[PDB]
Amino acid sequence: IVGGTASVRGEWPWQVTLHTTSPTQRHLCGGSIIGNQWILTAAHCFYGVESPKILRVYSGILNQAEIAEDTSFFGVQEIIIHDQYKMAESGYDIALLKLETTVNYADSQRPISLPSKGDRNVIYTDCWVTGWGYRKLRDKIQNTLQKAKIPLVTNEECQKRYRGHKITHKMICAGYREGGKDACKGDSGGPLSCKHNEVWHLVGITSWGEGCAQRERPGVYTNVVEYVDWILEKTQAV
Numbered sequence: 271i272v273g274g275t276a277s278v279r280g281e282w283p284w285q286v287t288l289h290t291t292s293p294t295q296r297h298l299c300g301g302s303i304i305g306n307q308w309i310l311t312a313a314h315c316f317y318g319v320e321s322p323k324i325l326r327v328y329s330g331i332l333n334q335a336e337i338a339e340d341t342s343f344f345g346v347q348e349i350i351i352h353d354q355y356k357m358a359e360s361g362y363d364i365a366l367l368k369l370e371t372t373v374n375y376a377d378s379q380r381p382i383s384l385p386s387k388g389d390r391n392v393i394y395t396d397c398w399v400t401g402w403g404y405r406k407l408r409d410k411i412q413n414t415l416q417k418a419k420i421p422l423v424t425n426e427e428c429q430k431r432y433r434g435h436k437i438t439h440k441m442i443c444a445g446y447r448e449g450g451k452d453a454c455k456g457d458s459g460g461p462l463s464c465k466h467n468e469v470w471h472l473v474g475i476t477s478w479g480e481g482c483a484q485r486e487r488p489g490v491y492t493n494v495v496e497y498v499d500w501i502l503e504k505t506q507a508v
């Protein structure tokens with residue numbers, strides 16, 4: 271996260287840090303708890319990932335330092351990538367992680383509600399992006415979860431900033447005309463939370479952007495509401 275500040279512990283209870291153990295353990299992506307056995311994250315986070323066995327999901331984390339060899343985690347039973355996903359910039363950058371065990375909810379770890387189709391008209395004015403990603407272009411994974419309040423921009427406005435891309439209605443952008451605050455590498459899979467009517471909604475999933483926090487270069491996110499049917503279908507037992 272660029273231009274953000276340190277989060278208060280437990281302030282974003284749905285935020286998880288997804289680690290890979292190969293070659294050695296490290297933070298791979300952010301993710302959001304949306305069900306007792308489900309994490310919603312970005313598809314491009316699993317590039318080169320041949321098996322869910324090298325993945326570890328850590329919930330209720332503020333500082334990466336809390337994570338040690340003796341720290342408990344949730345194993346991943348299955349990685350579900352949208353069948354139309356090819357790459358972040360083309361859309362469909364969404365994936366579900368089915369955990370091997372269930373998450374016991376508490377003040378430090380709870381699910382974030384998904385947006386409703388009837389809210390596609392709502393005008394979220396209190397949106398925040400969070401993660402342990404880069405604080406700059408040439409940076410590295412941060413210890414403390416960062417947060418930044420960022421205003422959403424219309425898709426038409428976003429399209430103007432990315433003339434070489436197709437900003438579809440399945441994408442949503444957020445950023446300041448002058449830049450300064452934005453998600454960055456490492457924040458991928460992270461949630462773009464917006465508080466509406468005293469309730470937090472998972473509006474977007476950190477997906478991509480040209481650089482980080484540059485002027486006239488809004489961050490691009492997966493428009494979650496456009497995938498509620500997909501999520502319902504993929505999360506139903508088999």
Ligand SMILES: Cc1c(O)cccc1C(=O)Nc1cccc2ccc(C(=N)N)cc12
Binds near residue numbers: 480482489
């Ligand atoms: C290519 C690259 C790096 O190597 C290091 C840091 C940033 C970048 C980059 O251009 N874009 C990016 C690469 C991977 C994940 C990203 C997540 C969010 C954003 C965003 N601005 N909302 C940009 C990203």
